[PDB]
Amino acid sequence: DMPVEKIQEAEMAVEPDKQLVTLVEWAKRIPHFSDLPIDDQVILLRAGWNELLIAAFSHRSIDVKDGILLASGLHVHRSSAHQAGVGTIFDRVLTELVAKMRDMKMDKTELGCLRAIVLFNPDAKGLTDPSLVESLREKVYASLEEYCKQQYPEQPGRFAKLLLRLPALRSIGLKCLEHLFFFKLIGDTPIDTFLMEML
Amino acid sequence: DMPVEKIQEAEMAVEPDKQLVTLVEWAKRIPHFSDLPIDDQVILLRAGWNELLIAAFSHRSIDVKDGILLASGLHVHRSSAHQAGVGTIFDRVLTELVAKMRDMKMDKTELGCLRAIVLFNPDAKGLTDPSLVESLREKVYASLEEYCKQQYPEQPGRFAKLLLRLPALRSIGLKCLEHLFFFKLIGDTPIDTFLMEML
Amino acid sequence: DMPVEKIQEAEMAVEPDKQLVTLVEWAKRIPHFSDLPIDDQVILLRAGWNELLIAAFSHRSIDVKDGILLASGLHVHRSSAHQAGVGTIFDRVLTELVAKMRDMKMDKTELGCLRAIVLFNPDAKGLTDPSLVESLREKVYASLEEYCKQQYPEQPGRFAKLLLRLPALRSIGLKCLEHLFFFKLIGDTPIDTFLMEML
Amino acid sequence: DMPVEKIQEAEMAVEPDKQLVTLVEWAKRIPHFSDLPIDDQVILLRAGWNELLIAAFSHRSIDVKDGILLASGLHVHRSSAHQAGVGTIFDRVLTELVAKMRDMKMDKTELGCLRAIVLFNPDAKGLTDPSLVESLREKVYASLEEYCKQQYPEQPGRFAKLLLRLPALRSIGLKCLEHLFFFKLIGDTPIDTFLMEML
């Protein structure tokens, strides 16, 4: 089973380089993740890490005026980003993620699911078991849909609307990797040996 | 309304830089697209052109062994790609797009809808009316969902599974823009004055 | 020996995908290039192709007002490149190469030598003998220097000034590779098998 | 005048984000840099900062086995970089910069000059006075040439050899900017406001 409330709990359990650790605590609390073969666990974290962090801090910033707020309480600010020459990207985060999350009032539950769908990426290269990873993705989204239809009955197209925030998350995610400024927001790509302390 | 059969007919009307022309014919036949402010029509094609083209050829290549097949009948081939130093990206198209479309046997109707959802991108910068473009996207996906419930009732999660092919389409789309080789598959970014004969 | 007039002849013999052909005829005519092991001949052209061609068209454009002029007589134009969304990079070619070439009135002979320095790139990965390639670059620059002291004795720092046009040519060279527009000016990266008809 | 020993002293005065401070102290000690309009001083530093820091750490690493050595005593290590997925670029620094500096035994004085040449980049966008910036460059290189003919009379082509390390320094420089990893080596692009404490 892939119970929504257990994803909700996972999000809560971690509600505020240390980023990585709190990422790993989160992932372990997602149903079944830990039952994946260990190398696949590494791969899925090395692949999704930046999307996962961006999605979290975007949600966190829903109430923040101006910029974004990190879990470490680092408060970034739009102009600080513009001065670092990453304004276009930064505004993208604000407009395509933070704003959209705000206007539809995204649940902590819905966030968890989106990040779980991101986590369970069957397209990540090197997986011993792509098909197992695809099935967990499927169990996350089915559960998310039920959740939306039960909790938000007056909004028939809310599910899809959450889904369609993922291409944006994907663009932003790639672009962030290309400007050193963003190291201050999401660190660099996690190293194998280190992640392997998910063991 | 946003009737799927009219999207299906749009796809068929164009079934085999001439690429741009046939893209434009396609877009015209999507319900309401032409009712958009003309500058918005231009932005939406400039933004989506490459995803729209890759999505098209990927679906066309469902049957093809080895590589991908273009509407001009140029048949590319995996080795040609690897020779050109774009193998990683090329294999991403085959793995994340072509193969997934093949395994799920994507409808020409489902292709049309995904492509229309891509066309009606509310995040495209410069739109005089994002709000209106958002609503058309919403009319497309709702209409695609009923269609999947109608036509594939034994596959509860098929709608989401189609949607979740869009972040892949988005990464592949951006990576393609970074290798000269791909000019031979999708040309370069269309220029406004030129698109402006959607008038 | 590495006699400058033989490089000058090389330049002239080719003075106006066919691009690659005329690049190959050019390199053959550079003293000693053909004495290089044939795999190193391939590597050097595959590495330097884009800078070699940009350098060529930049010099040919010294006279042209507005934009740049290709050997095929394609005349690009500054607006056309800005409409294509590659204005910044195009402007760099005009400002950092074309203009500097014009102000200093670069020789055909000095063009030949710079391009031969670029062709004998000892840093090219996979060379069977980087040391031999280094020595040919050495024979080109020493030969260039004598020629500058002989022909422009009024200008003590002209040699260096020509050399320092190379970091820019390396910048522009890389940036060109990331925008499909430039396929129209330099093609894509040459493929091994094809170049191998240097045999 | 542009006396080489004053550049030598500049290098020495700084011999071991704090990075930027020591960069600023360095620049100030370069003859005439401080005479430049203040806005131009910020531009040249914002433009050259990465090349300047890379070239410094490269030279510092001449003796180090294995990897690179930072002024802060951070000792990076080849496989450390390979694990972070930046092995190709890292190898480039080692082969194209550190190795070549080693084999030719580059002087601290020759380092100073090369870095001065890089600092005095007349191609930097936004300069109020690119002509004045060009002249200081010229005074550095002429001065570097006499120094090389005085100090290394047995090596006629040493000057050109040093110069020809600059395109490499430019390639590496750009590529470094595209991987979050390197924020650990060079921080990100310096901000206007902050550099303006050159005042």
XYZ file of C-alpha atoms in Angstrom, chain C residues 91-92 95-96 100 117 121-123 125 134 137-138 141 145 149 156-161 163-172 174-175 178, chain D residues 51 91-92 95-96 100 117 121-123 125 134 137-138 141 145 149 156-161 163-171 174-175 178:
70
model
C 27.990 40.707 -31.110
C 31.050 39.093 -29.496
C 33.420 43.112 -31.368
C 36.072 40.706 -30.197
C 39.986 43.785 -33.662
C 48.419 27.582 -34.162
C 46.413 22.121 -30.481
C 48.578 20.002 -28.222
C 45.700 19.866 -25.661
C 42.406 14.689 -26.151
C 53.432 20.970 -29.574
C 52.715 24.894 -32.976
C 56.176 26.132 -31.799
C 54.558 30.857 -33.717
C 57.037 36.306 -34.836
C 59.232 41.807 -36.817
C 56.818 45.941 -31.251
C 53.794 44.291 -29.614
C 51.934 43.001 -32.668
C 52.864 39.293 -32.256
C 51.492 39.164 -28.728
C 48.447 41.166 -29.805
C 48.232 35.660 -29.869
C 45.844 37.390 -27.405
C 43.088 37.188 -29.905
C 43.077 33.431 -29.160
C 41.353 33.342 -25.779
C 38.428 35.255 -27.256
C 38.345 32.904 -30.246
C 38.182 30.050 -27.709
C 35.305 31.700 -25.766
C 33.246 32.466 -28.843
C 32.523 27.271 -27.141
C 29.545 29.543 -26.970
C 25.359 25.773 -27.693
C 40.353 32.809 -14.366
C 41.694 16.594 -15.281
C 41.838 19.595 -17.650
C 46.847 18.560 -17.606
C 46.346 21.913 -19.312
C 52.312 22.808 -18.267
C 47.048 40.332 -18.582
C 40.789 42.404 -20.282
C 39.675 45.051 -22.721
C 36.838 42.757 -23.955
C 31.497 44.426 -21.356
C 44.026 47.732 -23.605
C 47.508 45.021 -20.974
C 50.113 46.066 -23.557
C 52.955 41.963 -21.950
C 58.591 39.759 -22.796
C 64.383 37.439 -22.720
C 63.431 32.161 -27.427
C 59.776 31.079 -27.526
C 59.039 31.187 -23.768
C 56.915 34.361 -23.928
C 54.543 32.972 -26.591
C 54.456 29.713 -24.618
C 50.647 33.519 -23.624
C 49.371 30.333 -25.232
C 48.327 29.068 -21.845
C 45.565 31.697 -21.882
C 43.059 30.038 -24.217
C 43.240 26.957 -21.979
C 42.714 29.182 -18.922
C 39.676 30.619 -20.718
C 38.112 27.164 -21.588
C 34.020 28.776 -18.529
C 33.509 25.131 -17.807
C 28.817 25.194 -14.989
